[PDB]
From a paper:
γ-Glutamyltranspeptidase (GGT) is an enzyme that plays a central role in glutathione metabolism, and acivicin is a classical inhibitor of GGT. GGT is a heterodimeric enzyme consisting of large (L; ∼40 kDa) and small (S; ∼20 kDa) subunits that are formed from an inactive precursor protein (∼60 kDa) by post-translational and autocatalytic cleavage. The autocatalytic processing requires a specific nucleophilic residue (Thr) that catalyzes the cleavage of the peptide bond just preceding this residue to liberate the catalytic S subunit with this residue at its N-­terminus. Bacterial GGTs share the same overall fold, but B. subtilis GGT is unique in that it lacks a lid-loop that covers the bound substrate and has a tail at the C-terminal end of the L subunit.
To gain insights into the binding affinity of the acivicin moiety, we assessed the electron-density maps after soaking the GGT crystals in acivicin solution for various soaking times and trapping its binding processes by flash-cooling. A similar vague electron density was also observed in the substrate-free E. coli GGT structure. The differences are discussed in terms of the recognition of the α-­amino and α-carboxy groups in preference to the dihydro­isoxazole ring, as observed in time-lapse soaking crystal structures of B. subtilis GGT with acivicin.
Residue numbers in the entry:
A (entry chain A): 37 to 396
B (entry chain B): 403 to 586
Write the structure that this text describes.
Amino acid sequence: EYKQVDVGKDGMVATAHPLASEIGADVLKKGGNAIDAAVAIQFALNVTEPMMSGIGGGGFMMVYDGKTKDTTIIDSRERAPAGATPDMFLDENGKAIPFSERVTKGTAVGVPGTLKGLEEALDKWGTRSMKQLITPSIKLAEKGFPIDSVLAEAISDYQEKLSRTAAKDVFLPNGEPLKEGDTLIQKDLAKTFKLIRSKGTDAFYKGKFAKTLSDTVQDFGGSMTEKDLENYDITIDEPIWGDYQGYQIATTPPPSSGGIFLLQMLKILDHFNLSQYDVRSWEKYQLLAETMHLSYADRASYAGDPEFVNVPLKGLLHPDYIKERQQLINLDQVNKKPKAGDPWKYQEGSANYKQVEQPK
Amino acid sequence: TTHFTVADRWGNVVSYTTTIEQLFGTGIMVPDYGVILNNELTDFDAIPGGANEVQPNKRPLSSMTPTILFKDDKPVLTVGSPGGATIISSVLQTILYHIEYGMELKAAVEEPRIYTNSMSSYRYEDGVPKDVLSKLNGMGHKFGTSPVDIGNVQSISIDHENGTFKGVADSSRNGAAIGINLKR
């Protein structure tokens, strides 16, 4: 069996799938570093947890370099194609296409970054080639593995959308979902990984795969071209740092909302000395809920890709701004109309965008 | 989305969140190549004009929050999670329970979480007391009639004085933590 807590003297791996953790650990055991292991783990999870991540998507990889002592982020978040438009998720009446329908459309497909990110990570810090690191996943894709509970639940839940594409041949063989613990074989994906191993990431971003990917997006109504794939590159992002209870915290900046609002909620909540309240007390949950409403409101108003929009980071994290927000919170009463604050009173400039409420 | 983390014997530390958006993304597979395509662009606002509107070549806002915490200029803890908009709250709660409440790491990860991004959207995990939910709803919150799992935190802590690592996987999935003890 496998453990959900472990200790070690010479390293550690934690992932959502035991086969991926085993592959990451083997890289470390064989003299690889944490970046080599992470790259191998991503390929492994692409195969063994296929609903959740892979070369069809994008991610944020934070790396502390033990040599240089620097922390940087490989940002492989997907890009909208050149043919994307502001109103592309609206119907003819200018109203939002229902989310459940929106999700299955070719217009939803971002230019994938994950593979470019892995290539970058290896360029920067790798001591094992992508050929070495992708090999365990080639074997898992080609030869198969028996499906875990979280996977078998996914296939059942999502049968409708899988049935309308090529995915049906993998996950719904003979027209029905695979069960626990049936064997999942991914021959085409294995072939793709082999192409990447032999040709490098051009097997993905150029040539016949790139043509097939873009034609398929277009078949499903999206605008992605081979040029969009050829143009794609990752971004190296500088972490945003905060102080909390004697710790320095390195977290992710825009185009992620996570770092700003993690720091903002910690700064708001730090004021309340939560440990004075029992960990299961209504007081604690109240303070958490009220803080979330305020921060999530600011997120909806002010966060986006910083290559494009002026995110008021200075204002949102200004200690006097934090003070204003905390003052809006009571134990005894709930804000029924929580709204974004005005971080612009605590920094220079103004938004190059409007305040537009999203439906639901 | 999924989150994982690795630390090695040379002090390198990785905290990596990665996704195709929905479970199975769009559900579209590149024919003859087996690649499942993300629906990531639905993370943009459907109605344009604001910070997170769609533009060509723009990236949709993410809630992914891979994080590394430091003490005395060394990395001591990694945190991250999947779960869409709930991600920021799962990372927040893990740090609160481990640091503010001083709970051991596995316990901090397993502590029942809540999430709520507006007056009309609430989630809570099994273990949030029924009388707490009643008290909160009585003030105007809108927690529902059944719990849901929230997030999936993988985390590594590092003890630099003892020279040891500890890894934790969240019980919300079947993850595994594996320590390295080299024979050499």
